[PDB]
Structures are given as C-alpha cells and as structure tokens.
Enzyme design. Structure first.
Site, PDB file in Angstrom:
ATOM      1  N   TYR A 212      60.369  14.507  35.091  1.00  0.00           N
ATOM      2  CA  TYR A 212      61.204  15.654  34.733  1.00  0.00           C
ATOM      3  C   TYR A 212      60.603  17.003  35.116  1.00  0.00           C
ATOM      4  O   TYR A 212      61.137  18.050  34.758  1.00  0.00           O
ATOM      5  CB  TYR A 212      61.493  15.638  33.232  1.00  0.00           C
ATOM      6  CG  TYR A 212      60.275  15.365  32.381  1.00  0.00           C
ATOM      7  CD1 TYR A 212      59.310  16.345  32.192  1.00  0.00           C
ATOM      8  CD2 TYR A 212      60.082  14.124  31.776  1.00  0.00           C
ATOM      9  CE1 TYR A 212      58.198  16.107  31.419  1.00  0.00           C
ATOM     10  CE2 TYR A 212      58.964  13.873  30.997  1.00  0.00           C
ATOM     11  CZ  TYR A 212      58.025  14.873  30.825  1.00  0.00           C
ATOM     12  OH  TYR A 212      56.908  14.654  30.056  1.00  0.00           O
TER      13      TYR A 212
ATOM     14  N   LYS B 284      52.477  19.541  32.194  1.00  0.00           N
ATOM     15  CA  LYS B 284      53.690  18.900  32.664  1.00  0.00           C
ATOM     16  C   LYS B 284      54.873  19.830  32.385  1.00  0.00           C
ATOM     17  O   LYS B 284      55.225  20.087  31.240  1.00  0.00           O
ATOM     18  CB  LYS B 284      53.871  17.520  32.002  1.00  0.00           C
ATOM     19  CG  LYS B 284      52.823  16.514  32.466  1.00  0.00           C
ATOM     20  CD  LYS B 284      52.984  15.151  31.771  1.00  0.00           C
ATOM     21  CE  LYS B 284      54.318  14.491  32.128  1.00  0.00           C
ATOM     22  NZ  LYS B 284      54.431  13.065  31.647  1.00  0.00           N
TER      23      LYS B 284
ATOM     24  N   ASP C   6      54.411   0.668  30.664  1.00  0.00           N
ATOM     25  CA  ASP C   6      54.296   1.172  32.032  1.00  0.00           C
ATOM     26  C   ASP C   6      52.833   1.291  32.427  1.00  0.00           C
ATOM     27  O   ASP C   6      52.398   2.257  33.079  1.00  0.00           O
ATOM     28  CB  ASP C   6      55.044   2.513  32.172  1.00  0.00           C
ATOM     29  CG  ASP C   6      55.287   2.912  33.626  1.00  0.00           C
ATOM     30  OD1 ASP C   6      55.222   2.021  34.503  1.00  0.00           O
ATOM     31  OD2 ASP C   6      55.555   4.119  33.889  1.00  0.00           O
TER      32      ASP C   6
ATOM     33  N   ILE D  85      49.195  18.902  40.837  1.00  0.00           N
ATOM     34  CA  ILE D  85      48.403  17.668  40.945  1.00  0.00           C
ATOM     35  C   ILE D  85      49.244  16.412  40.785  1.00  0.00           C
ATOM     36  O   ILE D  85      48.768  15.294  40.995  1.00  0.00           O
ATOM     37  CB  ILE D  85      47.269  17.623  39.910  1.00  0.00           C
ATOM     38  CG1 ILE D  85      47.790  18.058  38.543  1.00  0.00           C
ATOM     39  CG2 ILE D  85      46.093  18.494  40.362  1.00  0.00           C
ATOM     40  CD1 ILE D  85      46.805  17.866  37.435  1.00  0.00           C
ATOM     41  N   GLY D  86      50.499  16.593  40.406  1.00  0.00           N
ATOM     42  CA  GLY D  86      51.386  15.463  40.257  1.00  0.00           C
ATOM     43  C   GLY D  86      52.828  15.888  40.328  1.00  0.00           C
ATOM     44  O   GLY D  86      53.179  17.017  39.962  1.00  0.00           O
ATOM     45  N   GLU D  87      53.660  15.014  40.877  1.00  0.00           N
ATOM     46  CA  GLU D  87      55.091  15.164  40.705  1.00  0.00           C
ATOM     47  C   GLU D  87      55.525  14.164  39.650  1.00  0.00           C
ATOM     48  O   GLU D  87      55.194  12.982  39.717  1.00  0.00           O
ATOM     49  CB  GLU D  87      55.827  14.996  42.027  1.00  0.00           C
ATOM     50  CG  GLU D  87      55.501  16.138  42.980  1.00  0.00           C
ATOM     51  CD  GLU D  87      56.238  16.050  44.296  1.00  0.00           C
ATOM     52  OE1 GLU D  87      57.487  16.066  44.279  1.00  0.00           O
ATOM     53  OE2 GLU D  87      55.565  15.974  45.346  1.00  0.00           O
TER      54      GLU D  87
HETATM   55  N1  LIG Z   1      46.250  15.018  31.662  1.00  0.00           N
HETATM   56  C1  LIG Z   1      46.275  14.897  32.977  1.00  0.00           C
HETATM   57  N2  LIG Z   1      45.246  15.301  33.706  1.00  0.00           N
HETATM   58  C2  LIG Z   1      45.265  15.179  35.014  1.00  0.00           C
HETATM   59  N3  LIG Z   1      46.260  14.663  35.707  1.00  0.00           N
HETATM   60  C3  LIG Z   1      47.355  14.220  35.103  1.00  0.00           C
HETATM   61  C4  LIG Z   1      47.415  14.319  33.669  1.00  0.00           C
HETATM   62  N4  LIG Z   1      48.573  13.826  33.330  1.00  0.00           N
HETATM   63  C5  LIG Z   1      49.206  13.451  34.439  1.00  0.00           C
HETATM   64  N5  LIG Z   1      48.482  13.688  35.503  1.00  0.00           N
HETATM   65  C6  LIG Z   1      48.837  13.369  36.867  1.00  0.00           C
HETATM   66  O1  LIG Z   1      50.217  13.402  37.046  1.00  0.00           O
HETATM   67  C7  LIG Z   1      50.739  12.129  37.383  1.00  0.00           C
HETATM   68  C8  LIG Z   1      52.066  11.869  36.696  1.00  0.00           C
HETATM   69  O2  LIG Z   1      51.920  11.988  35.305  1.00  0.00           O
HETATM   70  P1  LIG Z   1      52.495  10.906  34.334  1.00  0.00           P
HETATM   71  O3  LIG Z   1      52.167  11.317  33.001  1.00  0.00           O
HETATM   72  O4  LIG Z   1      52.022   9.604  34.761  1.00  0.00           O
HETATM   73  O5  LIG Z   1      54.035  10.937  34.446  1.00  0.00           O
HETATM   74  P2  LIG Z   1      54.984  10.191  35.429  1.00  0.00           P
HETATM   75  O6  LIG Z   1      54.213   9.039  35.913  1.00  0.00           O
HETATM   76  O7  LIG Z   1      56.035   9.840  34.500  1.00  0.00           O
HETATM   77  O8  LIG Z   1      55.453  11.129  36.433  1.00  0.00           O
HETATM   78  C9  LIG Z   1      49.693  11.138  36.944  1.00  0.00           C
HETATM   79  O9  LIG Z   1      49.666  10.060  37.843  1.00  0.00           O
HETATM   80  C10 LIG Z   1      48.426  11.933  37.041  1.00  0.00           C
HETATM   81  O10 LIG Z   1      47.941  11.770  38.360  1.00  0.00           O
HETATM   82 MG   LIG Z   2      53.081   7.877  35.246  1.00  0.00          MG
HETATM   83 MG   LIG Z   3      56.507   7.695  33.818  1.00  0.00          MG
END
Ligand SMILES: Nc1ncnc2c1ncn2[C@@H]1O[C@H](COP(=O)(O)OP(=O)(O)O)[C@@H](O)[C@H]1O
Ligand SMILES: [Mg+2]
Ligand SMILES: [Mg+2]
Lengths: 242, 322
Positions: free
Chosen positions: B22, B40, B134, B17-19
C-alpha cells in the site's frame, strides 16, 4: 496504550460543553449518533461487536472535538465505516451512505453536504488521529456470556437474565458508560440490574451462595455503589417514559 | 504515546528501500534523536475505500505483539499540511537481499542463531493466537548487530486453539506453501508457518529456495519428489482433503530428504526433516523445534554476528535492481 476512561468532572467539561452546549443536548446528540450507528450497521447486517466498536469510536471522538464543529451523523457513518475494516467485516462507504440516506430525513442528511462519501473519507484521517490508532476494543457482550456460563442454578432463569442483560448492554451504548468503566464491569452491572428487576438471587447460582457480593468471582474491587451508579444511568433511558 | 499526530518532517528521508503493498518503504532518520527508522507510507487519496484495510491489519496485530524477535512499530506520523507513515525500527537487511547479494557467508553457527531467533519469535507469535501466513526470506529482517526480526504481518490473523474454524486457503507464497494448503485445507493450524520456516532452513544451507514451481500442481510434484508422495501410510487424514485425488503427483515417491540434502549437518538435518513432515500433525511445533538438538542450547546473544556488509543495506528491492 493510552487511557480511555474519564470521571464525572471530565464528562461535564467536554469540548461540546466548553463551547456552551448544554449537557442535556450533548446527551441527546450521543444517543442519536449511537442509535444511528446501530440502525445503519443492523441494516447492513453487521456483527454486534462491529456496531459496538463503531459506537465506542464515536463516543471517544467527541471527548476531543465539539458537536458544534463536527456534525454527529457524518461522524457516525465514519466510525461504522472504520469499525467494519477493523473488525474484519468491511462495508463499502457507498453502502453506508445509501443506508444513511434511507434512515435520515432531509435536514438530518443535509449534514453530509454535496458529496456525502467524500465528507466521510476526509473525516477518517481525523478519526484515526483522534483515537490515536488504538483500534482494538472489547465490549461487555463477551464478558456477560463468559460470566453467565459459570452460573449454575436454573437454566430458564439464567437465560432470562442473559437475554435481558444483553438488552441493557445495547442501551448502555447510547450513554457515556463506555467512557467511564471497563467492559467487564458493565457486564457485571447489567447482570446485577437484570437480577434485581427479575427478583433473582444470583448468589444462589454460584459456589458461595451465602455471599451476597456474587460478582467478586468475576471482577476485582468493584463496590456496590459503582454498580448502582451504572444502573441509574441505564435506567435513565426509561426516563419517565421513553 | 499519542500516534498519528506528529509530522513526517520530523524525519529526514534517505531513500526508497522497499516497494510495499500500500505504499513505498523508506529508510529515514529521526532529526531530533538521530535514530534510524523505516517508514512504510500509506497513500490515502488514490484508493476509494480510504485507509487500507491491510495497513489496519498490521497496525492492529503489531500493537498486540511485543517480542525481541518480532518487528516493533514505533509510531505513526503524517504528512502535515495527506498520507500516513508507519514507523519501524530500521533493519539494515532482509534475508532475501543478503542471500542474493553474495556479500556474506552463513555457516552452521550463523544458521544456529538465525533459526533460534526466528523460532522464538514464531513461538511467541503462535502462543499468542496468531498465524503469520507469509513467512519467506524477504519478510525476515536482520540488523547489523545480527538480530533477527520477523516482519510483514499484513496477512496474519487470529486463530482458535479451542475450536476449529475455517480460514482462507491461498495465504503463503507458493515456494513456501505447505502440502495441506496445496491440497485445499481450510481448517489449518500453525503448522503451516513451521513448514515455511523449514523451507527457510534449507534455503540457508543451499543457495536458492528449495521448492520452485510456477503452478500449484507442479509445486506439489516438486515437494513430493523429495519429501515423498502424500499417502495415508504417512498421513492418514490426507484422504479427507478436497484435492487429494485430483492432484496426485506423477508417482508414489518415497521420501529421500536425508539423501537429497546430505551436505546438511546431522543435527540440522534432523530438524529439517521434522519441520518438513507432510502430515501437519507430525510436524514439529515452534516449541518443539526449539527443544531439538540443533537449537536447544543455542544462545544468540553470546554468539558473534556474521560480518554483514556495513556499507550496503541488502534488502529485496536493492538486489533485484542490480
Ligand atoms: N523495518 C524495516 N527495516 C528495513 N527494511 C524494511 C523494514 N520493513 C520493511 N522493509 C523492507 O521493505 C520490504 C517490504 O516490507 P514488508 O513489510 O515486507 O511489506 P510487503 O512485503 O507487504 O510489501 C521488506 O522486504 C524489507 O526489505
Ligand atoms: Mg513482505
Ligand atoms: Mg506483505
């Protein structure tokens, strides 16, 4: 948060004692590991809090693992490496290894095997798991400074107290004291020890001078006995000689 | 209890769901309890300074912070057999995703609630002596119950509220970065997080982010053409900033914020204005934002959630993919 404090019974039944390591040899292993962390970090110019955090990880690591299974200097390097990152004062693992090579003799450094850096890196996973990812730690220094700053009688004697107590905090880190009592208490104990060695009456530097138990203003429910106990453990490092 | 020791196969992995910085971010489900979580992932072998100092930061700070409007780190697990996985409560959406989805409409009352929650979290986070540094829409998560959590603490740090010491200058993403940073301040305050939220507030009323440029000079220009030029009359200390002379905008613009955003309701507009004060010392605190008319009486628990798509998790990654 987990519990990071053990009593005397517990410390006599560490994983190293359970595998037959004599108490005196484990005590020397912890001193050597601690002084090693202190010496490497110092030569890398690290904050005293960063050294202390490294040493506390070290002492905690060996409540769960045995010295017979995990060579103490490799763990030392691993703990300093991790402490640097945690305390926002990072050093490259390669720098820790060279400093380690510089300070150890051939046999001691033999502990790191054929690839010193990669022995440290693989240990870091295990370290993090063992300390349960509870990275934040506080040390007696900050409390010693906070408490002394509320003492008021003689600017010069007060500084002698602080300086000598500071030295005792450094000594205390070579012992399991941080596994036994909270930093606040250690801070009070080193002030108490310094005061007695300097023949200082610390009471006279507070708002209640007729009260011999001057430390109750800083910490709650600490008996004299506990303070004397900490003193003897610290004084033991000045054993006959040493 | 004891983190880092349970195995990641305790979870069934549903999808990326996200990149992340790290590692990738996964949606997964606890095989025992049925709870939804976010994972994560932290890769360790690729990088040669081992466990990522950024993950270390999130772990250290998130463990100190406990609040209903700040994301909760549940535990840490491992590939058991080797990477680690940070485990969070699963949040169905983030604000960047929802906004660019076009599957929902946020009216004034939704905005009332979001801002109330976000501000209570930031206030808590500021009154614990932390800056976030941020704040932006992809870092604000929203569950289907309508609950806001502030997230992504990878750039947060302790700040002194007794003394005044210097901090890193390049910290907030550009479109949400305040004027004092753009002019080179290093001894900044929690006011930099309030500026960011002020941008969020506008962005919730309009379609897109409110100040979009690709370089710092052009960005300050855009800000100035709406918020007024930085000048001693509104900001006496501005002359003490490193780049004030070199980065003066095209004109000395007069503030026209209440004009350029006249569609925004009155109470909201007052907050918007107050959050976007050029002079950080004139900018409302999180506590002050919460005493304002727009949020003072707002009680999020007694308000209905917007009808969020129950069938599609609107996160930043999913949006830019489609
Ligand atoms: N607890 C969570 N539940 C659902 N999605 C998440 C959660 N944490 C992060 N994400 C998704 O992952 C993305 C990246 O996570 P994030 O914590 O913002 O780290 P980074 O921005 O440093 O990569 C977020 O934009 C969000 O869309
Ligand atoms: Mg972020
Ligand atoms: Mg970040």
């Amino acid at each position: 948060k987990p519990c990071w404090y053990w009593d005397k019974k517990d410390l006599a039944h560490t994983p190293s004692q359970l595998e037959g390591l004599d108490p005196a040899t484990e005590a020397r292993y912890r001193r050597e590991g601690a002084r090693f962390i202190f010496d490497v970090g110092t030569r890398l110019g690290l904050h005293y809090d960063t050294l202390a955090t490294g040493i506390i990880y070290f002492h905690r690591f060996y409540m769960f693992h045995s010295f017979k299974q995990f060579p103490r200097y490799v763990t030392g390097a691993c703990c300093l490496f991790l402490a640097g990152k945690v305390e926002e004062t990072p050093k490259k693992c390669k720098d820790i290894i060279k400093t380690a090579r510089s300070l150890l003799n051939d046999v001691q450094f033999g502990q790191f095997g054929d690839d010193p850096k990669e022995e440290v890196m693989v240990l870091e996973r295990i370290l993090l798991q063992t300390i349960k990812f509870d990275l934040q730690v506080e040390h007696p220094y900050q409390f010693l400074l906070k408490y002394a700053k509320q003492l008021k009688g003689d600017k010069n004697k007060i500084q002698k107290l602080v300086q000598m107590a500071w030295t005792f905090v450094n000594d205390s880190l070579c012992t399991t004291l941080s596994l036994q009592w909270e930093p606040e208490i250690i801070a009070v104990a080193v002030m108490y020890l310094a005061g007695r060695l300097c023949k200082f009456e610390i009471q006279e530097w507070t708002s209640k001078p007729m009260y011999r138990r001057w430390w109750e203003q800083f910490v709650q429910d600490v008996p004299v006995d506990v303070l004397e106990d900490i003193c003897h453990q610290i004084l033991d490092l000045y054993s006959q000689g040493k | 209890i004891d983190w880092g020791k349970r195995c990641v196969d305790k979870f069934d992995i549903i999808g990326i769901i996200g990149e992340g910085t790290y590692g990738q971010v996964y949606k997964a489900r606890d095989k025992d309890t049925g709870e939804m979580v976010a994972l994560k992932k932290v890769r360790l072998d690729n990088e040669k300074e081992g466990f990522p100092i950024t993950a270390i930061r999130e772990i250290k700070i998130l463990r100190q912070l406990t609040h209903q409007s700040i994301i909760n780190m549940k535990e840490i697990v491992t590939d058991k057999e080797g990477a680690f996985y940070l485990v969070f409560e699963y949040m169905d959406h983030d604000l960047m995703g929802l906004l660019e989805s076009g599957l929902v409409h946020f009216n004034e009352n939704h905005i009332k609630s979001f801002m109330r929650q976000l501000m209570e979290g930031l206030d808590y986070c500021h009154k614990k002596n932390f800056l976030h540094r941020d704040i932006k829409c992809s870092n604000i998560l929203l569950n289907n119950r309508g609950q806001i959590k502030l997230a992504d603490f990878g750039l947060a740090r302790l700040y002194s509220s007794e003394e005044s010491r210097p901090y890193t200058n390049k910290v907030i993403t550009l479109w949400y970065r305040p004027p004092e940073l753009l002019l080179g301040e290093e001894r900044y305050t929690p006011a930099i997080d309030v500026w960011s939220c002020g941008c969020i507030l506008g962005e919730l009323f309009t379609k897109k982010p409110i100040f979009q440029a690709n370089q710092e000079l052009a960005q300050l220009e855009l800000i100035s053409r709406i918020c007024g030029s930085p000048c001693p009359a509104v900001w006496p200390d501005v002359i003490k900033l490193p780049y004030f002379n070199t980065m003066k905008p095209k004109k000395q613009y007069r503030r026209k914020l209440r004009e350029e955003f006249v569609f925004i309701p009155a109470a909201a507009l007052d907050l918007f204005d107050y959050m976007l004060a050029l002079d950080p010392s004139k900018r409302c605190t999180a506590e002050q934002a919460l005493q304002c008319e727009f949020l003072r009486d707002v009680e999020p628990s007694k308000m209905p959630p917007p009808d969020l798509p129950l069938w599609q998790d609107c996160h930043e990654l999913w949006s830019k993919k489609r």
